[PDB]
With several copies, the nearest count.
Chain A
Amino acid sequence: VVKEDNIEAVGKKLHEYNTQFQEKSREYDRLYEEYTRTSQEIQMKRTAIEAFNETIKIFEEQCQTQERYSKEYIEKFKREGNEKEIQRIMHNYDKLKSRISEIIDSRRRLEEDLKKQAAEYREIDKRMNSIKPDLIQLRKTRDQYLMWLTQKGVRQKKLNEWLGN
């Protein structure tokens, strides 16, 4: 307690330490809430990217099913000199390729969203890693002062009023 004994001045310090500690607990549980929301975010985004993956897989399955149709029932729809009948797989092919391209672009959008949210989460995750040693150090200093400065004529109600501001 910076070798002080005014008692009243020593108590004023206790109130400054009160502020420091309280501010930390608020930012501490705020960082915990941020950790939880980022956790559920990457879980929702991984259930979305694996859905994207399985949809791309089944779309490639449809793409090879088009090649299967090019030998199953294409014999009666290409040698008759007609183009409107074949649109059920031919006009359903070019737009499927465009769908593949645009869902690949969407997957790239989800990947850049993933990396940007990971960056904005790690830029504060390192703050958590650095604020916790300082937090526990401040709490240890508060506990050490609570074993000396508090027994110099302050009341528990006074401590509650100091920590409640």
Chain B
Amino acid sequence: RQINTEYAVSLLEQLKLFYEQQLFTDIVLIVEGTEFPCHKMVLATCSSYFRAMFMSGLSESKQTHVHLRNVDAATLQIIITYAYTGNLAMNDSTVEQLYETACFLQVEDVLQRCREYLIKKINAENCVRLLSFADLFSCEELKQSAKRMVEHKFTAVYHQDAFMQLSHDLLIDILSSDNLNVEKEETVREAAMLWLEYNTESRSQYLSSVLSQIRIDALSEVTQRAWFQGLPPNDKSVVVQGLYKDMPKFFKPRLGMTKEEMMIFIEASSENPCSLYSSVCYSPQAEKVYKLCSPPADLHKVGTVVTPDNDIYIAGGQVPLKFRTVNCFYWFDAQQNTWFPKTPMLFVRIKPSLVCCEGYIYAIGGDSVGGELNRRTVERYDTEKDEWTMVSPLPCAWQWSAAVVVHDCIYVMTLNLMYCYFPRSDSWVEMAMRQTSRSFASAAAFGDKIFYIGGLSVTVEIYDVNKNEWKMAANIPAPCVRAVVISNSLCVFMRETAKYVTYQYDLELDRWSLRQHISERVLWDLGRDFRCTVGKLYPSCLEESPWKPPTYLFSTD
């Protein structure tokens, strides 16, 4: 019928065998003294540059020796190896030079592969360098991705040396963007100052363009501090999602002045049957719920973890049988409301205990008991390296266990025992046991004390990290509880099968005070298996969908 694949792979392997023994070599490429015999047809079919050079009919198609300059020998070898096979060795050490050589040779396949690899490899350490690279080589997709990454973590990357060596257009397009994740304009002002003072003799003429991009007369959230905070309870968030929108974009409050602390509920049951495992985030300050497009592959049984840098991650879980367990790792883009996948895990897990410790995210347990040494395995992920490293596994196989982090130390709790992990020692130490044997309990690290609340019957058990002793505090004022720390205060979001209400606990007085009721106006039944956490998100452009009539039960009579 058409091109047969069975002969195609045989012809390709025969061409490779002929190239290895140097048969029918008609062209000789000279790169910085090194010689490479090759065929003109393969280079023409793979690279359009060689195609145009050979189809011109000039001496280049007649002379056997062609001198190629400004081309690395290793990159040319990788291009030619790929030209005779199809496997691309893309590593983080030589990806930029490979992309440069490909764009100089115009290999569409290699160009696209290197582009997508660089896009899936943008971290918080190379974002600025990759942005400069994309600007120099005019790659719009990589440029936009790196710009978004810089806008997401500007306050963390504006100290790097790559930021002070940026061009003028990059500076004026980064500073003018309203997506700068900064809590104060003073940070952007000091960034511009250090950029202009890095090289004064060449940037003394750009001081006007520098000062014209920093908002000085904005006065975003200081004007509210001048008059008063007099409003309905914590209605400063309404001004955030109101004044910001309607703004000439010159005095606009930057995106960093818009993030609000919201209770992130994932796998929260939804009235809509299609998405019975949806995810919504109720803002305690704005008193409003915001819809999330959280499920990237309509799956569930995934854990939640919020780093101190306010980053959301989900891992583990299983997709419906097209319920096969998977390894995908998803990071949430708080600006685009879309999860970008990462390097999959090494072992499949179901609701893994994900906690952030010393910049690493650890996957603890969260899987059905299979194999003595095969289970209880613990694995951590490197953020910048995008890799998974195995660590000392769990001492014993547990179920429905929780994990917290205090003082850069890992803690996992079980029925009545407790083990503390130290990354510096990579070992497990059994700690003070608990007087009660309970399951399905929720735990949240607050200050120097770990709170263990649950049991499936509620009892507030306080552990001291400094004393290694467990002391009883009280009971949850009531049961489906979710202990979460918000507003620098320990709280418990309890669901009374459904009624919703949040309580505040006093550590000194050992008393639980009513903090705020969550009227059934919105926040419908979220089920019982939903995972909860605390994080700051931009309500400005997250999602807007009430979905719930705040009034019902007509009283006309």
Contact = CB atoms under 8 A, between A and B. Distances in A.
A159 B235 CA distance: 48
A51 B239 contact: yes
Interface in A32-63: 32-33, 36-37, 40, 44, 47-48, 51-52, 54-55, 57-58, 62
Among A47, A92, A95, A99, the one with the most B-chain Cβ atoms within 10 Å of its Cβ is: A47
Contacts of A132: 556
Contacts of B239: 47-48, 51
A102 B549 contact: no
A136 interface: yes
Interface in B230-248: 231-232, 235, 238-239, 242-243, 246, 248
Contacts of B246: 48, 106, 109-110
Interface size class of B (residues with CB under 8 A): 20 to 34
Nearest to B246: A106
Contacts of B238: 44, 47-48
Contacts of A151: 497
Contacts of B549: 29, 32-33, 36
A28 interface: yes
A48 B243 contact: yes
The DSSP consensus for interface residues of chain B is loop
B59 interface: no
Interface string B468-508: 00000000000000000000000000000100000000000
B425 interface: no
Nearest to A147: B497
The DSSP consensus for interface residues of chain A is helix
Interface size class of A (residues with CB under 8 A): 20 to 34
A104 to B, nearest CB: 12
B227 A47 contact: no
B138 interface: no
B212 to A, nearest CB: 9
B550 interface: yes
Contacts of B251: 99
B242 A51 contact: yes
B173 interface: no
B219 A47 contact: no
B217 interface: yes
Given A48-B242, A55-B243, A58-B227, A29 B554 contact: yes
Given A44-B238, A58-B223, A28 B554 contact: yes
Contacts of B319: none
Given A36-B550, A47-B231, A92 B243 contact: no
Nearest to A52: B243
B235 A47 contact: yes
A96 interface: yes
B248 A99 contact: yes
B460 interface: no
B219 to A, nearest CB: 7
A54 B227 contact: yes
B285 to A, nearest CB: 13
Contacts of B248: 99, 102
B497 A148 contact: yes
Contact of B554 (A32, A37, A48): A32
Given A48-B242, A51-B243, A58-B226, A29 B552 contact: yes
B243 A32 contact: no
Nearest to B232: A47
A105 to B, nearest CB: 10
B216 interface: yes
Interface in A89-129: 92, 95-96, 99, 102, 106, 109-110
Nearest to B228: A54
Interface in A3-28: 28
Given A47-B239, A58-B223, A132-B556, A32 B497 contact: no
A92 B556 contact: no
B56 interface: no
Contacts of B552: 29
Nearest to A35: B551
B217 A96 contact: yes
Contacts of A62: 217, 219
B551 A32 contact: yes
Contacts of B554: 28-29, 32
Interface string B515-557: 0000000000000000000000000000000100111101010
Contacts of B550: 36, 40
Given A55-B223, A58-B223, A151-B497, A44 B551 contact: no
B556 A136 contact: yes
Given A29-B552, A47-B239, A51-B243, A92 B226 contact: no
Contacts of A51: 239, 242-243
B73 to A, nearest CB: 53
Nearest to A95: B217
Contacts of B232: 47
Interface in A116-165: 132, 136, 147-148, 151
Contact of B217 (A29, A52, A99): A99
Contacts of A36: 549-551
Nearest to B497: A151
23 contacts: A29-B552, A29-B554, A32-B551, A36-B550, A36-B551, A47-B239, A47-B242, A48-B239, A48-B243, A48-B246, A51-B239, A51-B242, A51-B243, A58-B223, A58-B227, A92-B217, A95-B217, A96-B217, A102-B248, A109-B246, A132-B556, A148-B497, A151-B497
In the A-B complex, list the 10 residue pairs whose CB atoms are closest, starting with the nearest. A48-B242, A33-B549, A58-B223, A47-B238, A51-B239, A36-B550, A51-B243, A54-B227, A102-B248, A36-B551
Given A28-B554, A29-B552, 20 more contacts: A33-B549, A36-B550, A36-B551, A37-B546, A47-B239, A48-B242, A48-B246, A52-B243, A55-B223, A58-B226, A62-B217, A92-B216, A92-B217, A99-B217, A99-B248, A102-B248, A110-B246, A147-B497, A148-B497, A151-B497
